[PDB]
Amino acid sequence: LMVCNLAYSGKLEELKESILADKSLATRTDQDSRTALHWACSAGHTEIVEFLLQLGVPVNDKDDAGWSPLHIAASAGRDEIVKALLGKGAQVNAVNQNGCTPLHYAASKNRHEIAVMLLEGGANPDAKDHYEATAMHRAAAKGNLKMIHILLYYKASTNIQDTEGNTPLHLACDEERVEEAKLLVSQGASIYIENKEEKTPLQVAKGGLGLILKRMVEG
Template identity: 25%
Template structure:
């Protein structure tokens, strides 16, 4: 989650790469060799890293790892800071006051002693440049929500010239706050009648973002606001599909406890059980079975759960 550090540019530290759907786009490319050369376990929060400047290489390696957006082009070849290491080893990296999800294979660690004065001067200059206040109130609201500034959000919404469902970088304030786990922000937004069912460009709703961000408490809040726990995005993935793919077992349990369907199929015919088998998550598989997941459903390749397990070499 993005945490405010009290600096003057906190309201600019928004994670603009809020795309649960994009993170599971299928690809035949498997950058195993790249990952071995640049293992993600070498990265820690706070590390300085340099992002690859080869746009085609970055586009390729970002598949299934946050994807690539043209808004990321200015970050190529620049230095950023790791602010989060996800459970699947992808990295959230802050560059120019914004945060993006990167495949660890597209960045290299930069030691402080090898960082040039010019690099650091450029980095500091860009950070200062991001302190300017946006003149777009909707943009400001999304940024504040992404950073957990609940009091400022409430104050902004009381002005009356801000749309609580306004969009910035294809996302609403509720979607940004849901992925980043800002419970107090969500309460403020819901108090101002935020729409829990608005979809982003990928069809993901706030509940999808909460599942992606590993935020079971947010899932509960959204359920209380009558959000659809079985909502589907453009790839027909439910929040449960997202949570299983990311390996967020507490979110999986919360969704199941709230009564979500355990066996809905995505655009490829895969159920959450197919996904759990693919990820070799026996703990999640067991949990799905406890909630009566259907093992007979076949995906578009004609494989049910048993076929899929055999295909993946999962004897258990």
Template identity: 30%
Template structure:
């Protein structure tokens, strides 16, 4: 019964992680450790789910309990747990994942070449943006998507002024004026965002 999944691929352990029930998670892991490796129908593992939902206590437990393999597993769109935490702006979780995964986790890109920094910029999470740049320097900042978009493009397109200003102060004028594959600069995208 513990291993049984719902029609969309969720086992009870994944649901416990999604809902933030640490005590239930611990009980389930004791009864069947293999549950930690199960995935939902969308390819999420239990660590992905906890990172996405912002359950830092569950993330900390999983990082202590699980192998490093779980940390680097990707979703169907090639995102890692760090991508999900950055997208949602869960700063404490981002810091814990960085501590556990190190530099190798920073430079994994999701579908379309999206880095964790692109996602933090697109979703307006300035604290996470600053953390990632402080940890990686300009290497992650200069990363482009497959469409040629920089993190500045992402922030401007979504109208995140504070992030755009922060990034513009770190970049050279040439990089600020960089055109994506559609021939649009970050400023062009900012005009479209209003």
């Protein structure tokens, strides 16, 4: 629609005169079940979402797949948009297409402020998706150490079994992250859990890193 270009490019007076001339444009959606809030949150505009959320647009408007705008603000890295959506009362544990939560995508961008705002509002630290994977599996899958640490500021679990039976320690050792494996083990990781292919975190680690893994377990 036209409001997709208006909220996309950031036309201030064109969108203001467009909504003040026709209030239906705010509630109108395109063929992909995406309203102006999804385009202005995907674009990161503050004033436009302050006007749309000021008029009182439903914050829980999901698309065809189920992507809530809180995933867009969490993955977007825009702290102010998270302040606005959480200020309006967004669902901190909204279910998207693949059953994930905004914690996984805010963790993907390594945005600490968004994680503090979401987890402070009551987000589940151990929120599992369809594949039984939490934010620690993905943050460890890229190397977000401080994101896992601020996840541990909220007493998150470090032994979530993945869809293949892999704990976050398995993915930390698979990513060849030494400090992350030593920190997860030092903070309560389990080295005895086995996956579907029957491989312990010691065997998954190469270069004799399992000896210092178990050494730090006993030490």
